Write a protein that binds this ligand. Structure first.
Ligand SMILES: [Cl-]
Ligand SMILES: [Cl-]
Lengths: 278, 278
């Protein structure tokens, strides 16, 4: 665990770290924001933020503008990378697959089975590292964008007792039924689509147990050029209304898929999570 | 004038444009944020933002997080480039000179005198263009960071009656007495140091007329690596005191030279300028 950068922002501190990840079998870099006053005697809750295709930890920390409200609500923020990295990790030219595009699953197909275990990384390895080295409690929530939105809602659904709430921006709610997901699932999981269902939010919500329901918020711009071919938000809503799941999906008129969009409603999400984090 | 990008943010709109600039004799790109409600029948005041070395219009728009408060206060933001651009425009690898480093002056030394007229650009051409194609009024304020901070205070002091207020983040207040200024002024203005004074905030403030005094706010992080070698805020504090100039310079403990610092207090500056812009 090595601190590679540190900067003050909104009374708090933004810091990047690197560490030899066991789940990804490679060096991983993640960013952490500690609100003002966070200490071993005053531990704070945590919001995990998963980014989308081609992103790293820096995109959100630099363009979301989440610090102001996070400092105010006393919420720490951990932003992990989107995949394993390095010349010893497989990769291909496409931006929508392999490095920079882990889809937060545990690849079973070789050669991706070795390092592409972003699921275990985000769900087990990182949280353990965070709670052991930072002034934070075990109370946590999760959110993300696009591929990361898919990750947040999917991970929440699969770990109902470990997250108090979940949200997402422009999420890929039904990977099984979109090019990005089909490609990602085929390469990482194989052609047996029955193994895909365990990583699809729509499939997961449908089989969800009422007692494990948890507060969910989703923001989506109706000017998102990926709205119909990859995102398909209505697919999740339909399932949510079948299960009476506590999901709130809001279309924001005129907004797109960029961080200008994320920054426009990140505060709504922080307030949303704060309610359950505390 | 050609619009090259458009995105919605905080209810308003962020847009980038290019045009054939006369002053710089080259195509120039700038960005504009119109708060929600801005229209021909409802025009709004403008805050010009001057960026520092190596920056363009995007750094501030993407990393400052100024839209929430600007949209709330009804303030339009114009962020021009930092110098002329193009393969036919003089340039060199140095990050502190030539392109991305116009220092907001009108170059007198060839070959720079042809395109390096950022003073003329930001002060005369740009405002005329903005007020001609956008739902903005004539009321304006100006701010900036580092080289842009130098630009903001300098431009305001040189045109006391055309700007209602001025502010800056980590400004180069005394370019004549720092490496960045010496190098830039020597290349752009020549060896005769007497021609540099007209672009130095400390020299300028020293000769300000009482009735032309205007509100000024400067924010400087005390952990800024360029503080003592390039910025020297106290040099300006001294002049301001001798002239009873209404300058308030605050040292922000623990903050650096980055946009993390800027994003931390941009709201304070917006509120600052709002008072005079309305
Ligand atoms: Cl692998
Ligand atoms: Cl030139």
């Amino acid at each position: 665990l090595e601190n590679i950068s540190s900067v003050k922002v909104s009374g708090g501190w933004h810091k990047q770290y690197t560490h030899s990840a066991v789940s990804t079998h490679c060096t991983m870099r993640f960013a952490v924001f500690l609100p003002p006053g966070a200490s071993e005697s005053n531990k704070v809750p945590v919001l995990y933020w998963l980014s989308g295709l081609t992103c790293t930890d820096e995109n959100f920390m630099q363009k979301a503008g989440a610090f102001k409200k996070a400092a105010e609500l006393g919420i720490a923020i951990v932003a992990p990378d989107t995949s394993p990295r390095g010349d010893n990790v497989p990769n291909e030219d496409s931006y929508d697959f392999a490095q920079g595009a882990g889809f937060y699953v545990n690849a079973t197909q070789a050669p991706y089975n070795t390092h592409f275990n972003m699921y275990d990384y985000v769900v087990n390895e990182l949280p353990a590292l965070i709670e052991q080295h930072f002034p934070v409690t075990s109370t946590k929530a999760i959110s993300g964008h696009s591929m990361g939105g898919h990750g947040a809602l999917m991970i929440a659904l699969k770990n109902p007792q470990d997250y108090v709430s979940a949200s997402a921006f422009s999420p890929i709610v039904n990977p099984i039924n979109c090019p990005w997901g089909v490609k990602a699932f085929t390469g990482y999981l194989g052609a047996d689509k029955t193994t895909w269902a365990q990583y699809d939010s729509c499939k997961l919500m449908a089989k969800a147990e009422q007692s494990n329901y948890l507060p969910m918020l989703v923001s989506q711009g109706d000017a998102d050029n990926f709205l119909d071919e990859q995102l398909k938000p209505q697919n999740l809503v339909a399932v949510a209304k079948q299960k009476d799941y506590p999901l709130t999906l809001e279309m924001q008129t005129g907004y797109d898929h960029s961080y200008f969009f994320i920054s426009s409603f990140i505060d709504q999400h922080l307030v949303f999570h704060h309610q359950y984090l505390s």
